[PDB]
Homo-oligomer: A and B are copies of this chain.
Amino acid sequence: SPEQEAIESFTSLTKCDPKVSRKYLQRNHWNINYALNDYYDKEIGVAHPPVYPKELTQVFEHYINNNLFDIDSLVKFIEELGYNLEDLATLCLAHLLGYKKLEEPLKREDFLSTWFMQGCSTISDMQECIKTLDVKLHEDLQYFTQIYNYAFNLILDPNRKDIDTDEGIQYWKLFFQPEYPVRMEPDLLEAWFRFLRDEGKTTISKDTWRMLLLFFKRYPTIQKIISDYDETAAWPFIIDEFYECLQDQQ
């Protein structure tokens, strides 16, 4: 389709949002020549201030790959900011930017609007923002729980309902560090990892992921489990089995 082709060309040549491509084409009777000419005439500079500061759109465009802000852009981006893909602060960023899955490319409007709302246009600003979120992860339990539950949804592969146990263990190790709001005994954590490996549990469901945070806040030590745990409560089976194995191990 000739009109579809024109939008795609315009978007490639200018690196603009596709909605903006349709607007320039509509204003120029869908003739790409006149649309480019209209558009550039506008860039030079009775035009209007851009929606977004030039510094900000430049960041986005710097990391875009083939018209897409895709997982590679993101890794490159977080790189520049001073983090790793598997950092907890990166979950906070991804949550901030509205990622639903790390594989889906990030919309240009989602990037620009997010940073603009936070008053950021430079790498250096973006850095201060993320640092402030990382403080909130250490200090606000509601925000900590949002991110903890979010992490599962982001780890979760296309067309799967559970995560692999190695990735869940990798994240548990980050989330249950005592600088974060859910403090628990290290022996209990180590016992949990050993149990999952002994039992050869290969996947973790969303129920288990969520209930484990509640279980550790309720029973933060092995002695509190042995002492107080109610096997007729509403805990998942795997938590009951963990209890039986702790009680067997004394």
A: which residues have CB within 8 A of B? 17, 19-20, 23-24, 27, 39, 42, 48-51, 96, 109, 113, 116-118, 133, 141-142, 145, 214, 217-218, 228-234
Contact = CB atoms under 8 A, between A and B. Distances in A.
Contacts of A19: 234
A185 B164 CA distance: 51
A212 to B, nearest CB: 12
A234 B109 contact: yes
Given A109-B234, A218-B51, A117 B145 contact: yes
23 contacts: A17-B234, A20-B232, A20-B234, A23-B231, A23-B232, A24-B232, A39-B232, A48-B228, A48-B229, A49-B230, A50-B230, A51-B230, A51-B233, A51-B234, A96-B142, A109-B234, A113-B214, A116-B214, A116-B218, A117-B145, A117-B214, A117-B217, A133-B142
Identical copies of this chain, number: 2
A234 B19 CA distance: 5
Contacts of A142: 96, 118, 133
Nearest to A233: B51
Given A20-B232, A51-B233, A232-B20, A117 B96 contact: no
